[PDB]
Amino acid sequence: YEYVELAKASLTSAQPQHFYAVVIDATFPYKTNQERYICSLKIVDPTLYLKQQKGAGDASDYATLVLYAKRFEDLPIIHRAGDIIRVHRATLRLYNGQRQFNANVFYSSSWALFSTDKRSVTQEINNQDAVSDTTPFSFSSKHATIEKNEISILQNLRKWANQYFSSYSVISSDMYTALNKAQAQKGDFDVVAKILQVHELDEYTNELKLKDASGQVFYTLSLKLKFPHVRTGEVVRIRSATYDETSTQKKVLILSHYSNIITFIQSSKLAKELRAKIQDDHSVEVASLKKNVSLNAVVLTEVDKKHAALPSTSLQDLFHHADSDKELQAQDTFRTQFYVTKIEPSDVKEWVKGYDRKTKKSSSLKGASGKGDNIFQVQFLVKDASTQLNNNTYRVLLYTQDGLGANFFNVKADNLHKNADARKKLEDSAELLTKFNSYVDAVVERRNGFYLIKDTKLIY
Template identity: 35%
Template sequence: MQTTQHNNSTTSNRSNNYIYHSLGNIDPDSQDQYNFFGVIIDAAYPYKTSNGKYICTIKVVDQTIHHKGESSSPLFANVVIYAKRFEDLPIIRRVGDIMRVHRANVKFFNDMRQFYVNLQYNSSWCLFHQNQDKDDDDFDDNDSDENQNGEDQEMLDQDQLKEKQLERQEKRRYKPYKFSGRSYTFDINHEKIIMDNIRTWGQNYFANNYVITKDMYMLLKDCKTKMSNDESQEFDLLCKILKIFEKDENNLEIRIKDLSQEMWFMSVPRFKFQSLKQGEVIRIRCVEVNLTSKRNVIQTKNNTNILRFHPSSRIATELSKVIEDETDMDKVLGDEASDIVMNAVVLTEITDSSLARGQMFKLTDLFLNFDQIPENLRERNAFRVRFYCLRIDPIDHREVVQAYCPECSETYSCETLEKEGKGKCKSCKVECKLIYKMQMLVKDSSSQMNKNFYRILLYSFDEDRGNDFFSNVRPCNLYKNADALETIEKQIKAMTKFNVWIDAIIERQGAFFLIRDTKITQVIN
């Protein structure tokens, strides 16, 4: 790709060789080879096939084949490029770029035109930026050969300078930033008009349409449930980059969120994706969900591609507003590698691993809109939540353990009981057992900005409802066990500290939510 050979002359013999067709005017049953321009709306990363060839698939549209709006089903043409070597294939970084293809074969595949571009024969491709006029492209397009010579500059007056600048701009507009083979041709007289037309059309198309429709990506909130049945399944995403961290020499950790407003983590190779920016809306191709991680982790693969959007495209401007920025809850979830969250601690662990990876519920939804939660989830009655405690009752921590009557559910203070806490119910005369009876006034990120707080109970009348909640202690008479009282008081104190969060499973019983399958595992002094 070193030697570039422009072919700007009208007298060239080759200038008449290329007749360009609109995508929709190409007969898919034809045996002919076709030349065309297309606006790229999607592209995979090149990968090696089982027969040792390299392949790259790209979706293109033009004035004659495209879909409109958000909901319409995607309409495009597929371009499949084959090559012997990886480096002969295009790596697409931005949707909206223009692709020119020479000598493609065509077939109908899944009701769409599919173009075959075989670089081992005589096919070729060129890539052009969507918009070369504005200085808004931060891609390295290796234009150093066009940099002006300082000596020349001094000899020119203002008008001449302007003229030169225009000339250079003009030249840049029609210069591909990547092309296959060793050289390319561009017949300025013939192709300029086609190029200008498709560029203008493409810019308008992206400015007025979402282009990426709902059936072209998965929501982050669905990827665990939909993928857990088949671990090898790949999917695509559409999300916003909340934060980028330098993970190590070779990798960046990016935090992403999409329209489901869930935050996920993704580690990406630095050399492939170093131009990504915080706040940017991106399309991610070919990823998997990491089902073994406790955090929400998207796993990249060799053929994962991340595509950026032109800043003026509708999907980028609208989604960057609709998708939330990082919330305080996200900061807690992203407990690693961030200076902001350095002091945030999640005090507890969920002891049931199948629940620990479940979806996180908002307290507002559970307490105020419980009926709107899907029936199957309400029936399961185990909701993962993350909250912080404003206050814990009773204030007298010796009363946190109570004597409970299994017959009438009445509870009594242990104050008058002996050390073992043995005692009988005053009305039923049956043996009581010792349980935790504690109330937490809590908030989560959904209620952080309003006055609402919620009451969650640690009420361990049932064995698996929280007898193991505190670390290194079980319910006992706290009036007579000084060591146990100290152990519990220390943990209660930790629960109400600033930036300490409780990750818990709660279940609904009548009008109350009770903690279960949750244990304090962190020690804070």
């Protein structure tokens, strides 16, 4: 197999040509009719990557690659921009002034994907190591062969990809639309934004809270199965979104089956700059707290920094599988998300009790001090997406006698029958916690079959 650079490929031969290229954009593989699936991509290489820079405006230049197949599984799922694709038997032609490589995977063409970063997106998600730096993480057909001579092509292209992504935006300004101008678009458009929050709306869907360089915040639904790589704090390019005219309560982008959500390789200058520049916005949340009913979700808490890398565990797993699953049994500390249905004891004044450390007994402070050290002994009854349809509510404790969760309310334990200031703050917190669409993101510690909140604090 002889590999040709993108700008050097022949437009006259019409013969099958082969190449290695860096993928910068791609639709998700999609069905067009009863027998065809298509994946369209934008590709670059050392000979084709930037438009005549003078009056060009540092806009990226690229070739396009259209892959045709009879089955969904014969097409590449591009989760990240910057990785490498090797194509065999593509025919080239000019399509409206640009170099279009076409490949019928259902006939004789094939493709193979190589990770530019140490691990592919899927390997990062599952915490797996790559077989080797010359093994494709995905490919069409039952086999893929990498010859000794290709090794240098792959290694050199990787080095170049990192140089390209670190020196240029790659996804240039002409490749997307600012969110505050989304309503002005006639049809679909692209977006480059930071994911501020990933809210599990249900068993199959995530609701992404996005904010781009223009400062505008938008929400969009993202299927869990389709885009399992979405992560809070990360920057993504969204290929094909439309402005939802029927969303009155919040700004919403509608995605289609061909739409795609793409992250960037580690070296990305654009991703680095956006992760630092774009900052969290709680303006939507603050405004919603003034309404009796908020169609916008509000995460009321934040977990300690040391836990911001801990993966979350659903209530279904915490309460129904933690005594039977090997991986769950080996852990005592977990992170989870839920909404509070009811808080016990009902009387907010009883949330703080006097605790006798010798007898391990707590008591009401209505009679005051004679009960011991003041502590919170609060019992939340919660539910989440994984347990949404069942007839259960789950107990999550805020028992601070040993220090766990002491600062949860941003109110040090005090006699609530006497301290009006503390009682009032807690009553207000109670209303926020039980309000529809209010959720808690918390770290819990398993103790004698119960889960106690720790290293978690309200941020409202």
